[PDB]
C-alpha cells in the first residue's frame, strides 16, 4: 500500500499519529474508538472489530502502517455512506412520491452539470427497476449505484 505519492503518504501518517496514541506503532480498537469519538463518530466494538480484521492481514489484532494505509487510501470497503443514501433518495425524488422515476434522475443529473439524454436515464432505471414498475424505490435506487 506504500506505492503512493509522498504527499498522500504524509496525509495518512498524520492520521496514523491519531490512531496510535500510546505510541506502540500500531492501532487497536481502543485507540480507534478514541479517534472516532474525537472527530465525531461512534461505532461499537463489533463494528470496530469488523474494520480492524479487514485491514489486519497478520490477524494479530493490531493495525500496522501497510494495513492502515490499505484502510485509509483504498478505504478497504467499496461503499461510502449508504445510510445517507436514503436521505439523498428524497433529493432524486423531486416529485416526492417515495419513488424515483427516469424524469427525476434526469433533473438530478443535470444538476451535476454532466448532461445526458432521457434515454440514458431510462437505461439506468431499466437496470435498477427490480420490481419493474418504471420507478425505483430505496433499494432499487441504492443498488443502482451503491450496492449492498
Amino acid at each position: 500500500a506504500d506505492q503512493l505519492t509522498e504527499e498522500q503518504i504524509a496525509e495518512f501518517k498524520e492520521a496514523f499519529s491519531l490512531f496510535d496514541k500510546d505510541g506502540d506503532g500500531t492501532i487497536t480498537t481502543k485507540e480507534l474508538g478514541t479517534v472516532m469519538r474525537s472527530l465525531g463518530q461512534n461505532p461499537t466494538e463489533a463494528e470496530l472489530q469488523d474494520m480492524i480484521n479487514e485491514v489486519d492481514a497478520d490477524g494479530n489484532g493490531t493495525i500496522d502502517f501497510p494495513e492502515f494505509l490499505t484502510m485509509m487510501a483504498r478505504k478497504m470497503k467499496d461503499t461510502d455512506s449508504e445510510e445517507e443514501i436514503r436521505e439523498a433518495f428524497r433529493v432524486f425524488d423531486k416529485d416526492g412520491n417515495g419513488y424515483i422515476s427516469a424524469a427525476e434522475l434526469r433533473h438530478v443529473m443535470t444538476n451535476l452539470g454532466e448532461k445526458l439524454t432521457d434515454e440514458e436515464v431510462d437505461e439506468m432505471i431499466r437496470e435498477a427497476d427490480i420490481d419493474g414498475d418504471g420507478q425505483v424505490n430505496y433499494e432499487e435506487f441504492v443498488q443502482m449505484m451503491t450496492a449492498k
Binding site: D80, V108, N111, M145, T146
Partner: peptide, 18 residues
C-alpha cells in the same frame, strides 16, 4: 467506460465520494 453519445456519469451524485 467509453461513451460518446451516452451518459458519461450517473452514480457520481450519491457516491460523489471524498
Amino acid at each position: 467506460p467509453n461513451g460518446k453519445k451516452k451518459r458519461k456519469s450517473l452514480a457520481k451524485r450519491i457516491r460523489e465520494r471524498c
